[PDB]
Amino acid sequence: RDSDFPSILRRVFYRPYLQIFGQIPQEDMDVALMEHSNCSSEPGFWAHPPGAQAGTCVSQYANWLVVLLLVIFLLVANILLVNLLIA
Amino acid sequence: RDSDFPSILRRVFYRPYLQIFGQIPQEDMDVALMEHSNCSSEPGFWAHPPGAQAGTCVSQYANWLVVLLLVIFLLVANILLVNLLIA
C-alpha cells in the first residue's frame, strides 16, 4: 500500500540484491509470518508486514507463489550465477 | 556524533569486515530504517541509529549514497575479491 516511487525501487532492486548476501526478510514477504489485519478497503485478504520500508499492508492472495519465487531466486542467483562467475 | 577513536576505528574497519560474512546492519546505516529525531544542534536533518556502537545520531543528507556505497562494497568484496581468490 505504501507504493511511493523510492519505495517501489527499493523493494524491486535493493531488497532482492541484499538477499544474495544472506539478508532475507521473510517477515516482510511471507504472509504466514505476519498478522492478518483489515488494513485495506479493497476486496480480499491483507496482512501487515512489520518492516519499516515494507508496504505496511500486503496481499495474501497467492503468497505461496511469492515463497516459490524466493526459492527460485535464491537458486538462480546465490547458486547458479555466483558459481558460474567463479568458473 | 559518538566519534571516539575506538568507535571510528570500529565503524571504519570492523563493521565493513563483518559485512563480508553476512553481517549487514541496515538499521545503523540506512536512515529510512531509523527514527528521525532532533538529536544534533548542528544544522541539517539527523536520525537515531539503534545500534549500541553506532553514533546514536547520524546525518541523512546523502544517505542514498551510503546505500549505493554498501551495494558497491558488497559487489566488490563479497563477489569479486572472494571469487578472484578462489581462482
Curated annotation (Swiss-Prot), chains A, B:
Superkingdom of origin: Eukaryota
Sugar attachment sites: N38
Outcome after substituting I86T: In EKVP6; increased calcium activated cation channel activity; increased keratinocytes proliferation and differentiation; no effect on localization at cell membrane
Extracellular side: 1-9, 31-65
Effect of E27A: Results in a channel with normal permeability properties but with a reduced sensitivity to block by intracellular spermine
Span(s) of short sequence motif Selectivity filter: 21-23
Record-given protein name: Transient receptor potential cation channel subfamily M member 4
Organism, scientific name: Homo sapiens
UniProt lineage: Eukaryota, Metazoa, Chordata, Craniata, Vertebrata
Shown residues in whole-protein numbering: 955 to 1041 of 1214
